[PDB]
Amino acid sequence: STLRLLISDSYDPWFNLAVEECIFRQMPATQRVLFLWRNADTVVIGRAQNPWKECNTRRMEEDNVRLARRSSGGGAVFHDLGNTCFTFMAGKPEYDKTISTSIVLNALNALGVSAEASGRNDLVVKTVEGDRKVSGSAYRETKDRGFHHGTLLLNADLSRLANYLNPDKKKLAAKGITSVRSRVTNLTELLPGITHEQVCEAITEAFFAHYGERVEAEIISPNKTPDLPNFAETFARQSSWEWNFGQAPAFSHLLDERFTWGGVELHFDVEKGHITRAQVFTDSLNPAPLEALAGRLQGCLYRADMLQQECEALLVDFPEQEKELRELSAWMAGAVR
C-alpha cells in the first residue's frame, strides 16, 4: 500500500498549491502520489515568470481572476473549472516524468481520446484544421523527490483563457522565463459531455493499473485546514503578493503619458518587487516635484497603492501643483496595474 490518492475539493489555487508542496515535502521515501485538483478562474505562472509581462494583470484584477506563482518552472497557463490538474509524485531514483506522461495518455485512450506527447511539455491531438494542444506540464525535482503536474483542457472558457494570457502592451525589459504559445482546444470536441470526475476515474484507473494496486481516495476539504504539517505557513506564503508578484526576476518598466501640462516618462528598475531606482524625463515647465519624486520613489513597492501613497506624500511638499500630481498618481496607478 505505497500508492496514495489525494483529491482536492477546493478551487483556491493558493490553497491547492500549498497542499501540493506540503504533501510533496513530507512525502514518505517509497510512495507514489497522485493528486487531482482544479482551480476557479486563475492564472498560474512558473517560478521565474514576470506576471505583468506574461498575463493581463489589469484585466485579471478587474474580474478578480486569481494569480498564483508555482514552485515548478514553465510558462503561464489559465485555469477554470473546465481545466483539470494532475500531479504525479514519486521518490528517486524511481521518479520519471515519462512514466506519468504515458499514464495520462493511457487514461485518455481509455476514454477514447488519442493524444501524442509533443516537445518536452505538451500533449496534443489531431484535428481537421491542424494540431491542437490540450495539455501543459511542468516539473520540479529535488535530491530525493520529484513531481510532474500538468493540465487537461476539458471544457474551459478559451476566450477568457486567450484574454488574460494576452497581456497589455507594456514597455518591459525583464529576465525570467517567457511563455511558449501553442494553439489549444478542449477535449470536448473529441469526447462530448466530458466531465472532470470522468477524467479523474481514467487517470486514477491507469495509475492503479501501472503500479498494480489500489487505495481509497482521500478527500481534502476546502472549508477548513488540512492536518498536513507546516501548512498554514506555506499557504500564507503562497497567498502573499511577495511570492505571487514579488518573486519577479529583475526587470525594468518604461511608462509614459501626455498631460495637458506636459509629457512624462518614467523608468523603473525593479528587483524583488521593489523599485530599486526610478528616473523621470519630462518637458514640463515644473520638474521640481517630479525630479523629487524619482528620488523619493526608491525602495517603493511596485504597486498602485504605494505609488499613490508616495504621490500624496508629495503633494504635502509641492502644493502649487496639487492638480497635476493628482493626474500623475491617477495615471501612474493604472499604468502598473
Ligand X SMILES: CCCCCCCCOP(=O)(O)OC[C@H]1O[C@@H](n2cnc3c(N)ncnc32)[C@H](O)[C@@H]1O
Residues near 135 by beta carbon (within 8 Å), at least 6 away in sequence: 104, 115, 122, 123, 124, 150, 151, 152, 153
55 binds ligand X (CB under 6 A): no
Of 150-158, 168-176, 218-226, 324-332, the segment contacting ligand X by CB under 6 A is 150-158
> Does 246 help bind other proteins (rule: CB under 8 A)?
no
Residue (158 or 315) nearer to ligand X, CB: 158
Instruction: Confirm if 172 and 69 have CB atoms less than 8 A apart.
Output: no
Q: What are 86's three cell numbers?
A: 494532475
User: Whose grid coordinates read 476514454?
Assistant: 111
Residue 77 marked as a ligand binder? yes
133 is in an annotated binding site: yes
- Is residue 147 within 8 A of residue 137, CB to CB? The reply is no
150 near ligand X, judged by CB under 6 A = yes
Q: How far is the CB of 125 from ligand X (least distance, A)?
A: 12
C-alpha cell at 42: 486563475
- Report whether 184 belongs to an annotated binding site: no
Residues 139 and 135: their CA atoms lie apart, in Å, by: 14
Q: In the set 8, 57, 83, 155, which binds ligand X (CB under 6 A)? A: 83
Contact 38, 81 (CB under 8 A): yes
Our CB check for other proteins shows the closer of 87 and 329 to be: 87
Q: Which is nearer to ligand X, 184 or 294 (CB)?
A: 184
* Closest distance of CB 60 from other proteins, Å: 23
Interaction residues for ligand X, span 167-206 (CB under 6 A):
179-182, 184
Our finding on whether 143 is near other proteins (CB under 8 A) is yes
175 interacts with other proteins by CB under 8 A = yes
Q: Which is nearer to other proteins, 48 or 117 (CB)?
A: 48
Closest to ligand X by CB, 74 or 91 = 74
**Strands 274-282 and 251-259, sheet pairing:** unpaired
Residue 237: name the closest of 7, 21, 8, 27 by CA.
21
Helical pair 13-25 and 231-238, crossing angle rounded to 10 deg: 140
Choosing from 138, 199, 270, 297, the residue that interacts with other proteins (CB under 8 A) is: 138
Q: How far apart are CA 120 and CA 140, in angstroms?
A: 14
Question: Which one of 7, 48, 254, 315 is in contact with other proteins (CB under 8 A)?
Answer: 48
CB atoms within 10 A of CB 1: 7
Q: Which partner in ligand X, other proteins, none is near 190 (CB below 5 to 8 A by kind)?
A: none
Positions in the binding site for other proteins (CB under 8 A): 46-48, 71-73, 93, 97, 120, 138-143, 146, 175-177, 249-250
